[PDB]
Amino acid sequence: GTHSHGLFKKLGIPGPTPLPFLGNILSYHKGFCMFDMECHKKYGKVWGFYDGQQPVLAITDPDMIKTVLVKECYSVFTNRRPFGPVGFMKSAISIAEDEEWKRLRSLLSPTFTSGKLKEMVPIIAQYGDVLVRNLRREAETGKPVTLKDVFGAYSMDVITSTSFGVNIDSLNNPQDPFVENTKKLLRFDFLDPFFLSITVFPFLIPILEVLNICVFPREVTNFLRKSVKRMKESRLEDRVDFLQLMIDSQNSHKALSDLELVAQSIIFIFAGYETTSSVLSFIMYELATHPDVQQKLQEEIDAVLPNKAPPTYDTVLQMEYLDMVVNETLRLFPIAMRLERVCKKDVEINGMFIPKGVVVMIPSYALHRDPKYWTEPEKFLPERFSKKNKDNIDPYIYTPFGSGPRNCIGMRFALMNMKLALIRVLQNFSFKPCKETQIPLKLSLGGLLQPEKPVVLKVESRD
Amino acid sequence: GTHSHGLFKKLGIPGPTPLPFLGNILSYHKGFCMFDMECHKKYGKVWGFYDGQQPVLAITDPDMIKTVLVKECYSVFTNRRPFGPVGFMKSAISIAEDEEWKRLRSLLSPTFTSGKLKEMVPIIAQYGDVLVRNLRREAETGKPVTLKDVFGAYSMDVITSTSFGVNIDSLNNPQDPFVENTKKLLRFDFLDPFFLSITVFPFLIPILEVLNICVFPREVTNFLRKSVKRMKESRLEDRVDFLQLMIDSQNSHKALSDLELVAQSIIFIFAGYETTSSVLSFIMYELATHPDVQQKLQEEIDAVLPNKAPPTYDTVLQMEYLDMVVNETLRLFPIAMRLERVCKKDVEINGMFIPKGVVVMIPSYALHRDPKYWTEPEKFLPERFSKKNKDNIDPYIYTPFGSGPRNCIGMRFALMNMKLALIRVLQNFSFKPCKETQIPLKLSLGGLLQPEKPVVLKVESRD
Ligand code: HEM
Ligand code: HEM
Predict the structure, then answer these.
(1) Count of Cβ atoms closer than 10 Å to residue B174 Cβ
(2) Do the strands A339-342 and A46-51 form a parallel or antiparallel pair, or are they unpaired?
(3) Chain A: nearest CA to B345, how far in angstroms?
(4) Where on this chain does heme bind (chains A, B)?
(5) How many CB atoms sit inside 10 A of residue A61's CB?
(6) How many domains does chain A have?
């Protein structure tokens, strides 16, 4: 339980001294973000710690971050950390490694071009209209609104239609079989008891795989696998969704196997579902607690889109203050918290030796709130991202979507999705705090960047 | 227990149908060689089977064998099969993989040049004199001699002196601490209950490694590790052995770490100890049961080395009939039985697709006795290897030392070692069957190519 706990000592790298077997995981009692902030503050630009026996090297120099995420991505820093028993989802692009990831990224990148996105915009926009209709119910009864619920439904609606052409008002069909399955693809809490145990007993992962025990719910993955087979078999006899693009990609490296395709369909839900709804909720919390910013944003929207004109791909990209609001919220709440890459081979990068097998970690949350780069980092200040000020932002300090060849493949889609939701909602409503609104917002101490209590807000119709 | 058991069926490759969990391991009840001979006979040039869940593709075409062992060695077929919990012996050259093997092979190849070998010959020759002295005791009492005992002692003597400068008459110091340790580095029986269980439960290997349970005896490896540290620390203050060559290589890729060095010292014992003594025993069994061949060999020795002249590097390499006898015995008894390489990536080689992760196996024992290539393959016929006949021998059918960049690194040393022993012994003695000699020889049904009963022979002094 100590074998590798001498590594950073031998390399002269500072960090919290690890306990046998556990390493440093007891320092996670306040979650990832507080641990990373405290280590940054007390150890400086680089430090190392141990998740069980696994050494993790944290780096904060932007030039070093570029070398890892960009310059040496294919040669040395290709893969993320393996995390638990995964079964056939081994073929999902975010979990695949080395040449197999490189292949999958090539097969799937044409699916995320601006041209495919623009062709999807009318689809996503339809569910913004559904969102507004549902919000209007509660704006009329005066009941406070739980944001994760309404933005969760929106997120689900956009996924099911843009992924499979499945058109559902999920907020009002919460027991449609397709919705009750996809709702279960939530983000993993890596500080929960199962994942803590796997970190201390990583040698048990092969035992779980041989028993077909999978961190992705078996019932959900099998429902989706058989649903997809049915859509594929259909369709053929008699759409601009991700499934159709992937189906088309199967007829011209060696094509995308049928199982590989279902794995991507599932991982796209997992990657986009709770991420989008969380960020939307943080944004509306910031707008509700900064009425001046909400008004300025509604003024911009009304100017670009007079008389509640429906948003379009081009009109969205025109809105600079909208972009500034989205960007500043993601500075405060980079829901990934950390970026990680395994070091595949002994390397020396910009001054320091990094041994094979170390996980190199970029603490996005901590860098996003680092006073060296950000004046008053705890304040919500969209003007940081104005054309005036934004040139002073280092792209390797601000990394809410990662960076380089393995960054977020759905970044453009997620930005466009969230902005289209925000536009439609703000055209129709203003959001204000309740007495049940938690002000200021407290973050959870678990493994997910989420509010301590669900955000709840009053919705008032601008009509 | 069936996941991968459909692979050869899907590829249209024949082979014995596997049972759940076990695969084909129940067919090992007569050992590796009989299983490989029977499959070759009933399935043809290629077949597949499963060691538990691991698929193994057997190949017999010499052009395909060259492609695997030679042409695509670095790109695709670099590594042997992982086999059990190995601990720090992970750094031993025969167990290392990919770039780390390539590095170790580069660091260690200068240690096995003809020039280093010739410099070692006086050392090895000294223990041939010790062998003869010990044999003479039993040639005088008339007691039959157990070959593995006398050739085991010889093998040990040559190792301890050529590896560490440790000069011991091990047959008469059988409880010297250094001898009692090195005697334990015997070949693994992969059909024994532990290794059968590991084959059926390969998922338990990580559990064993985390508990520091190692297939190499811990007490032996630690005795040798501390012995080596003592020799290294000594020596320095105040030799042409492998240790000295490796020590010298540490002062000019990034040099050979201290632990890496001890790992090679241990693996060289493991690789050469029981291998050399087994082959010597097979050779003397063939000479004793073919007196005409033994006489012709003694006649050649007496002609090259009149009046029991001591053998030299150059005189050994002059003896053609000696070479033919050694080579034909190794045709009958290729103690490795099989050569193996893991397929690192999907490839198509000479006509057939081979998927990633399959073990490609070359059944040396079966090819060595294949009637297509060998007239009367069960007969001991040294004239096969005469300059007359030897051009008709395919170097990828006859592979007692493997082939290509990852062949036996100690091949020249082992040949020179065995020949020097045979020369000295045959200069002084003739070996004849006893009534306790098993004729014809029966092979064991376990996992090692060894006689069923120990070979025992009468030794008669030519004086
Ligand atoms: C606001 C919403 C989202 C945020 C903040 C976000 C953030 C991130 C981050 C930080 C990464 C890691 C990048 C790196 O390691 O350098 C990532 C990866 C990824 N995201 Fe997103 N993401 C979001 C939405 C989405 C959506 C909607 C999709 C799919 C439609 C998606 C698909 C992926 C995939 C596949 C990866 C792994 C890429 C690869 O391994 O090649 N994400 N995301
Ligand atoms: C008659 C005695 C010996 C026989 C029949 C023999 C046979 C073999 C065979 C068939 C291989 C596998 C080659 C392949 O996979 O293509 C091998 C590998 C090897 N042998 Fe030998 N061997 C003998 C003696 C020795 C000795 C004396 C040493 C060391 C001094 C040695 C060191 C090695 C090593 C290190 C490997 C692995 C090479 C690598 O992985 O790079 N062997 N041997």
Answers:
(1) 14
(2) unpaired
(3) 10
(4) 408
(5) 16
(6) 1
Token code pair at residue B114: 């003809």
Among B377, B376, B360, which Cα is nearest to B368's? B377
Tokens of A341: 């890459």
Give the Cα separation of A241 and A247 in Å (integer): 10
Q: Of A351, A345, A339, which is closest to residue A76 (Cα–Cα)?
A: A345
CB contact under 8 A, B99 and A203: no
Beginning with the edge strand found earlier in the chain, give each strand of the sheet holding B46-51 in spatial order: B46-51, B54-59, B359-362, B339-342
Pocket-forming residues, ligand 1, beta carbon under 6 Å: A 69, 93-94, 105, 267-268, 271-272, 275-276, 279, 335-336, 339, 400-403, 406-410, 413-414
Experimental approach was X-ray
Alpha helices in B67-110 (DSSP H): 98-108
DSSP states of B244-304: HHHHHHT-------HHHHHHHHHHHHHHHHHHHHHHHHHHHHHHHH-HHHHHHHHHHHHHH
Gap between the Cα atoms of B50 and B22, Å rounded:
8
Distance B186 CA to ligand 2 centre (A): 14
Residue B177, both tokens: 């601490």
B255 interfacial to chain A (CB closer than 8 Å): no
- Scanning A142-257, the segments in alpha helix (DSSP H) are 147-164, 177-182, 193-200, 205-210, 218-236, 242-249
**Is residue B57 in contact with ligand 2, taking CB distance under 6 Å?**
no
Query: What residues contact residue A397 under an 8 Å CB cut-off, 6+ apart?
Result: A62, A65, A367, A368, A370, A373
User: How far is residue B422's CA from residue B147's CA, in Å, rounded to a whole number?
Assistant: 13
Which H, E and C letters describe A329-372, residue by residue? HHHHCCCCCCEEEECCCCEEECCEEECCCCEEEECHHHHHCCCC
Q: Is A408 annotated as a binding residue?
A: yes
CA dist A151 → A125, A145, A154, A342 (Å): 14, 10, 5, 34
State the amino acid at position B47 in one-letter form. Answer: W
Q: A15 lies in which domain range?
A: 1-463
Distance to chain B for A171, nearest Cα, Å: 40
Q: Does residue B100 sit at the A interface (CB-CB below 8 Å)? A: no
Cα dihedral value A111, A112, A118, A120, nearest 10? 60
Which amino acid type is present at position B79? N
Token code pair at residue A121: 């915009």
Please tell me the distance from the alpha carbon of residue B336 to that of residue B364, in angstroms, as a whole number: 8
DSSP, collapsed to helix, strand or coil, labels residue B115 as helix
Ligand 2 pocket, B7 CB below 6 A?
no
Is the torsion defined by CA of A251, A256, A262, A266 positive or negative? negative
CA of B411 to the centre of ligand 2 (A): 6
Q: Which residue is listed with tokens 């429902």?
A: A223
In angstroms, the CA A217 to CA A383 distance is 43
| Amino acid identity for residue A42 in this structure | K
CATH number, position B264:
1.10.630.10
Closest CA relative to residue B367, chosen from B388, B340, B396: B396
User: Does B203 touch chain A if contact means CB atoms closer than 8 Å?
Assistant: yes
Structure tokens at A429: 């409503």
Q: Could you tell me the resolution of this structure in angstroms?
A: 1.8
Residues on chain B touching A103 (C-beta within 8 angstroms) = none
B211 part of contact set with chain A, CB < 8 Å: no
